[PDB]
Subunit: 233 residues, 6 copies
């Protein structure tokens, strides 16, 4: 129906888990869902619908960066009637308050993008998640025994930053890590009256240069997948 | 020992309620606190310390606008050891999702100020409250039977706006009301690693133009004072 | 009559002395005026009308920062028919050309605020005083034998600056001191076709670190008060 | 070896064709290359190395938006030593000088992104291709009988624009069409001293609403693919 | 001695009259000065030194636009030791407070240029003249019977404006006319510790569309030349 | 027929060589053209029409800086029907890729001006030349044995820069030299659907501090004059 999704209307459940990497979306479908069906594959951006503990859930890839994420989120809401969007992904830590394998709930997404100024009268849009979803993540993490870290992230247009000298200042202002999509998800969900939240897993520390190995990346990401699926039950 | 506060070091409790109007601060001290002492009065900007249900509580006026708010909040944190700052105040509603008497909890504060661009590398700082405090407000409001509305506010440098044509756009993006200080409170608490939250009571609707009577403004504000004091007890 | 002033129309004389501190406004009324009457007290922001050497003079406090100052100045012009607004206050000197106790007449007010960009097509508004009032201040200072320093000030949204490294640059560009309201007074008076001027007294030197004692502050400020009242006779 | 490309060092030829859609990349490898090997597939972002008329050429997908494109282009140039990057793709025409089927060569890429201001001291970076490549494209098109349209494109962070009222203005300034990556490819190739060029095929007209069927889209895209490969051969 | 001035060190008097049009500079030297010597002519941009009523007077052309004016003013101050710079020129009136043949003294120069943001830490520089010079102009105009109009001008990078819809707003904020150099003269003189002032004669009314004939333009300009020379004696 | 040009309609050929220095325009007319006639001289900004190798050529001075250039280019296109504008000039090198006496073809013109943001929706206009003219310059330089350097220039509002610390960054991004008009010529020709190109000759190296002597300046400029006239023949 859209240039970027070839699902039929109704193929998506009203709650959708989002991730930048469509191969990880496929991995979640195979490992954690029952009866999962591939519903879209335009540009190799895979999405699925299946069941977790008897509950229907959808999964959709969104690519990297605010511009890509905004395209998919816009279409999910406007065309596919998605109401609740839970994004997961990795991030690079910049604060001493977090370490490798930590899960962060982004109560705000700062950015170096111009997109929110374009959307919002050239002023400062404070891009934020839906509070009910934030409460649900916090409650579910308490239930599962997960030490959820809570603060802002910085959504950058740059993976290869030209402003590494500014990381300490961002950490001072309660930015725990850097990723590339949260501000676009939040602003699009705000634009279109939908509920959204971003969780992210610390795979790399940008201050120490320490990184997880491939094997511990998969293990730690699984912990955040389970948090997300449990919160959608 | 600041240009703006003449309290002695140690006169403030670590939890402080903030309001822009020092006469409303004095009203809270007289009506709701026990043994309230006026601890500061530079520029007629009054602050107090007293007890609510046996628990020490301080109150501080902060004046109008981000620049004034920032001065007082900075001094409270850096000189007076204040750790938790709960701002209450009125606001002008701009969204159909709220009406007069509603209490809004601002999970984000957008702004037309340049102050956060000056603080934050000329990028977009998403100014947000402390999550734990927002959870406490949610739980306390539920206990008290308050239908707490949760979303963004827009903190303006203007009371007499030159951009009233933009109010519908702001409301579309989940801005429930306009006030003049929240983004500064939030940014200063982020800067200084303190816990802050803003609650605001809808006194007027800037769109549909309804307005509370002076007698309803008292009952509605009292409702929000009680929420705040119960939160800090 | 407004949310911020509870005077009756007619209570203000057409010339009004402005100061951020309502307690200093009261002090001027009691020390320097005859038959002074308190005409407003909303938010503890006092204003008065009285006589100086047989001539009617009003005084009004305006709080701290551009947003606070703009609210009061807007209402004084639009509602209370004030035509001439003479602001006094303290400042932090940044130029070697001034020292403690000097009085500065601001022939321009630069700013880090975004307010003038919002007002003025996103361009640079050169915020300036009324020329007749500047001439009167210059002539009155000569008459009184005051060495009036004439240059720009920098009106900042920050008392606790994040840009102290730029003070020398600002002084190079003929900024003699920093305060927090002149640019808003000037822009509002420009907006509404009224006459405004700001004088400020050097209470502290931000470069040399020299500072007046509490008692020296009161004595030098009196010299400014006299200059101002004399220009309004 | 890089986070977004799992090719071996040396798997890329120094000439690489780029496209946002990795499924079109795989289509090109299957239909136009001989002995094509899939050399990378992280995030389902496919790249290939194969031969066209006896010469080795590589293909790489880059996703949607400047941020995504910049990631892949940076890694291609640095880790994989790619020297010539020829991007093809579709675009939405905004000018009367072009229509469906037309191939545009972008001698400049304007943008609503902030990325180039971040890169370029907050000034205006004129993002441009390598001139020798643009000359090779012009000569190859002439030899093949292609009526190459030459002008600027506008690279937007938005597929769903909030500024459709501005399309006529852009077309007046010689912007023939809108796409989402050219300015990022050009800025990154400038940063890293590599040769880049963007060609795009008009598949939709955003003014008139002309739109090609899936069959015409394939046939018109083939003409661009052949132009690109002939340029590299 | 500089790339733009071929005068010898010492050829300029410390007082210099400035004008954009070097042909008008030559006209002033021939008609109003005694013993006038042409001291510079690079790029046909003429300067002179002569006598007016026994007093040494220099004249220098500066071209059109802030960037051109800035070049000449910088060299006059830094290399040729000029201390006082009095600019005359024409302007396009935008205010009902002025009409054809009026002389405006610019106590502020607003601008659409980025130059002052580049100079002034990305903030708003309020570009203003030296007050002593403005007082001398006021007194001299009174002595000569000239009804000098006093307010801001808007210095634009555009003669052929793209923002004519904004002229009324500019006029509301006390901008009497538009020209193209004042803000650059004022900022450069502030930078380099020199005394500057701009006067301009209304040659065309941009609102009412009134314009002066070629012959009328000459006679009204003479009145401003005499004012400037009388002020410099 | 305009405020800045007093030629009659029809006095300009449709191809015009442009230079900032009207005395250099005069020098070109007398040394390289046959039957040259002065056609305009407002503000001493000279322009001529003559023949080179039997072919009609016009020459016009445009002064210094984007604002001055824009005035003349706008009038030449809109009033005098000029269709092709070839600008020559000097520049200050900032890249190791170029040295004194090198001729640069500017395939893009970056800028610190605000003019293109004002023209272009506050976004980034990539200011570029006409491709056919650039091909003609490239081919003509090859024919004449000139080693034409091809890259971006930076068109600045400043001859005396406040940002010399950024020169290396701009060179990294393929900016070979700094001048002051190219971005304005390019934006105006794009605005008005005309063909433009800028060549510039390195007179000074801003990094190494090398400079040409006065006689070297004339001799090296002659080589680019011949290049330009040859491409117009
Ligand atoms: Cl390690 C890492 N991860 C992510 Cl998600 C990033 N986003 C921007 N820079 C980044 N670095
Ligand atoms: Cl009614 C109302 N209240 C507040 Cl606090 C405001 N701030 C800015 N505009 C406003 N309107
Ligand atoms: Cl000492 C001093 N006084 C004032 Cl009024 C100020 N405004 C901003 N910084 C300041 N410092
Ligand atoms: Cl049809 C179309 N195609 C592309 Cl590539 C676009 N980019 C931004 N808007 C767009 N519209
Ligand atoms: Cl009539 C006229 N004169 C001048 Cl000096 C101008 N500057 C910018 N627009 C203008 N119009
Ligand atoms: Cl040497 C030199 N030449 C030119 Cl054309 C310039 N433009 C800006 N700075 C400059 N330096
Ligand atoms: Mg991820
Ligand atoms: Mg309030
Ligand atoms: Mg004060
Ligand atoms: Mg594409
Ligand atoms: Mg002039
Ligand atoms: Mg030149």
């Amino acid at each position: 129906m859209t240039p970027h999704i070839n699902a039929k209307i109704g193929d998506f459940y009203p709650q959708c888990l989002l991730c930048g990497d469509p191969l990880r979306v496929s991995y979640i479908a195979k490992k954690f869902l029952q009866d999962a069906k591939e519903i879209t594959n335009v540009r190799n951006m895979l999405g699925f619908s299946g069941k977790y503990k008897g509950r229907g859930i959808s999964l959709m890839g969104h690519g990297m960066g605010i511009a890509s994420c905004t395209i998919y989120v816009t279409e999910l809401i406007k065309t596919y009637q998605v109401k609740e969007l839970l994004r997961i992904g990795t991030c690079g830590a910049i604060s001493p308050k977090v370490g490798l394998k930590d899960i962060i709930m982004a109560t705000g997404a700062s950015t170096d993008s111009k997109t929110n100024r374009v959307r919002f009268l050239n002023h400062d849009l404070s891009a934020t998640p839906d509070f009910e979803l934030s409460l649900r993540a916090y409650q579910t993490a308490k239930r599962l025994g997960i030490d959820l870290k809570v603060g802002n992230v910085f959504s950058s247009d740059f993976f290869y930053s030209f402003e590494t000298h500014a990381f300490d200042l961002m950490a001072k202002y309660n930015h725990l890590a850097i990723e590339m999509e949260a501000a676009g998800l939040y602003a699009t969900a705000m634009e279109l009256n939908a509920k959204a939240l971003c969780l992210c897993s610390v795979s790399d520390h940008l201050i120490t240069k320490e990184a997880l190995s491939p094997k511990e990346r998969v293990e730690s990401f699984d912990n955040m997948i389970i948090l997300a699926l449990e919160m959608m039950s």
